[PDB]
Amino acid sequence: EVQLVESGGGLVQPGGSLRLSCAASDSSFYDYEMSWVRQVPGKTPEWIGSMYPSGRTYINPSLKSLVTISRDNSENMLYLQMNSLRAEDTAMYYCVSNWASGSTGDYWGQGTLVTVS
Amino acid sequence: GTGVLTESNKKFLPFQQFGRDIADTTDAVRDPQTLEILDITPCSFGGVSV
Amino acid sequence: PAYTNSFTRGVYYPDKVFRSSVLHSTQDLFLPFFSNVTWFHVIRFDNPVLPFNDGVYFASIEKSNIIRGWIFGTTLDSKTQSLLIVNNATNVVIKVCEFQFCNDPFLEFRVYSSANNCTFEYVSQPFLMGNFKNLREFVFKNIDGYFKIYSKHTPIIVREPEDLPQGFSALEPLVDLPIGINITRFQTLLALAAAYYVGYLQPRTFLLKYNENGTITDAVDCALDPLSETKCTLKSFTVEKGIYQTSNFRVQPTESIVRFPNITNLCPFDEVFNATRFASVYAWNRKRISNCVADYSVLYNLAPFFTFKCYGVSPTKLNDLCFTNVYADSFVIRGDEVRQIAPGQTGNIADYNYKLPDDFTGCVIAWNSNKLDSKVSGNYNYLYRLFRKSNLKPFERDISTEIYQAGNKPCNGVAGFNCYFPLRSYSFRPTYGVGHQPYRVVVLSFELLHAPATVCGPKKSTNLVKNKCVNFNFNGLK
Amino acid sequence: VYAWNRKRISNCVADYSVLYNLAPFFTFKCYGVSPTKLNDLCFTNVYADS
Amino acid sequence: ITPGTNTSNQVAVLYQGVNCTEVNVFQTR
Amino acid sequence: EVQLVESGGGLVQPGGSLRLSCAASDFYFDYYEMSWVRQAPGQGLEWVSTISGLGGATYYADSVKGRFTISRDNSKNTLYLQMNSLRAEDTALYYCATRSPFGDYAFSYWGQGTLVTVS
């Protein structure tokens, strides 16, 4: 039932603004958490940003003033805009729903590659 | 503890070092440096009546 | 082999206290009166290995000093410490070392071939040694480490056969050797017509009578027969005519019937200890673990446990109690923040993220995860709440993210100055001290209600034998 | 004097009471002053340089 | 029950609250 | 958006002194309240002292009345903590905190901390 499909992944030169979006299933996925996470090959997953139901989006302190999470569509979409891409941004990006409380209820959806060269 | 120390006629044994009574109180002792059996006994005591 | 009867022999002095005209009731290890001692006779050679359970009463109907030593040890193959006592002609050599003993050690130091390093050696000169026969009784005990040896020499007039005399002989203390190596077996050392009466000691209560000189004249076993108990229970060697109450005849149990419920599925303690990285602090993962067999022992190998504290129950003895429904609350905290996860203690996490009740009956367990949940980049994938209006209620999860107001300005959701965000991140760097390292903490809260229990430990249930006094070990009733 | 001896005296109970009243020792000025015959204050090791 | 050590050493034993089934042999009240 | 920088030592003789210098940056230290909070190993946090920014009065705890002193500088935004008369019972992790007096009772945010050893 949960088939979150990610789109936007491609080849962007260093300095561009990449706009990823994970289209969700037509259900009540709102009123819950929504998080992004990178999957650089050879390392543990790293949290990117949250999409708390109230509207307040918290960003990773390391990637501050570089990425942002926007949801001003309210229908089914969630957008992640990353600016000033660097070399270490080549990773597999995932958009999960049940983060920070998972390990037995987390639903890792699909994931696309992001290369910056 | 406290008490008087006098000479004893109690024939102790070479391994025994102390001595008790029915009340489980120290009765006799042996000086470690000089082999001699003493007798631990408290001094006079009682109640005062007016 | 043969067997002889111990006619009230083996009563040594319990302590080093002199007493006269008293009746003292001691509870030390003695030899029971009228016991069946071994009668190993040597003319033929007889020197077998005998167990050392609690104490040895080694008698010696000896002539020309045949028996000349003893060997105590556990393995007697140069792999464990062993005690050797020899007495050649003039002195006693008592040494604990790592000798290699052959199949038949005898006495010309043939009892060993190698000598490793030793840490103790005594050459206490006094050798512990033809009208009458010689009787050399020795009581060997190993209590509180110090190897106690009591010795007694007696001139015995040989009767028709070779039977232990019927008389009292108080053994005098000899040495206080500083030992304590494990000892479970022993053997005697002969020199090439004698016999020994090695016996075994066991706990018992003895009533001893001291004379005016301080020497024990007789003894009462207080467990050999009805009359003996009457004498002990009356503190007198002479009871008058009448009826006396001594003890209570209580039937001892037969078996240990358990009778636990019918539960075979293993407990899901693997998906809560060896899952993904972890959950957060304000969103601690709570899982109900019902209908399982909780084997906490496997929790000590799949994850190295640090300080384990259980409130209401003991750390051990958790496999014999069956709870009704247990709850596992898993999260991750800092190193110094592990003290706050306890009933009563306060702080930052104990009042804003996870609060335990004052009547918490369960086990909290934390272990460092600096190997899997750390990396040299800046660990910012764990959140925790620092600002809240009131204290968190025991067993309550705060998932809301309403902005905090530290002043009087109506922020109304701007998240700027004086409107600090209630959720912040940690900083788990592999170079920081142990106080700031991440620690995974699981809280197993138990429930003991009047209901059929569904979670216990791995104890095999036995059959129900009725009409017999047995030890019942039901879910919560022993 | 240029080859003053040096030997450690340890693992024993030094009793300095047997030193006095035998060829009386003058100039017993101590920089480690201890009127209790240089005892009652147990130390680790002592070095006698003669 | 002891007749006295000066007389002999044979004594008797009485168990209370039993029925001679779970302990010469005589049952009393 | 707001951080704290601390400095100091890591080992002090039991009877000596140490120079502790908390270096703040981009703060409204004129009407704010900056103080130190100790973290002894085995127990929680404890309050040490307090330095008022409105009048300038310095308050101490019960057991550190006559052994601690604080010097506040407003030219380069730095504080000096001259710890004197130290013994083996002062083992704690010091934190340089800063809060607003016209707010709640708890501090706003702390720093990274400094470890000292006295034994």
Next chain:
Amino acid sequence: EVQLVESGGGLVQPGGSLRLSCAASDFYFDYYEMSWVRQAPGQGLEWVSTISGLGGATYYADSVKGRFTISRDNSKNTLYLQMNSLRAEDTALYYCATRSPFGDYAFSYWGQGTLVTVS
């Protein structure tokens, strides 16, 4: 007025060895006492060994009798600590201290310390 300089490694294989060299300067190391004091993470400090400068006798602790060795040099005022038979239970912060045997029981002043890792 008096300081101490230490050196060493940062990572040791559990079963190898490491060269530890405490380099003192301007000391009365002929009749003074220098040794090492370990600092395991999570607990206090522990005594390791003792190196007398009077005659040259070296004393060890209970658990380091046959696994440590110390070489004292008086030509350039340096000490060598050849640690052998190392395992995962030797994680501690070593401190090179110096005291006067003809004084109190505690050391006069310590150094800066060195960190080693064995796992």
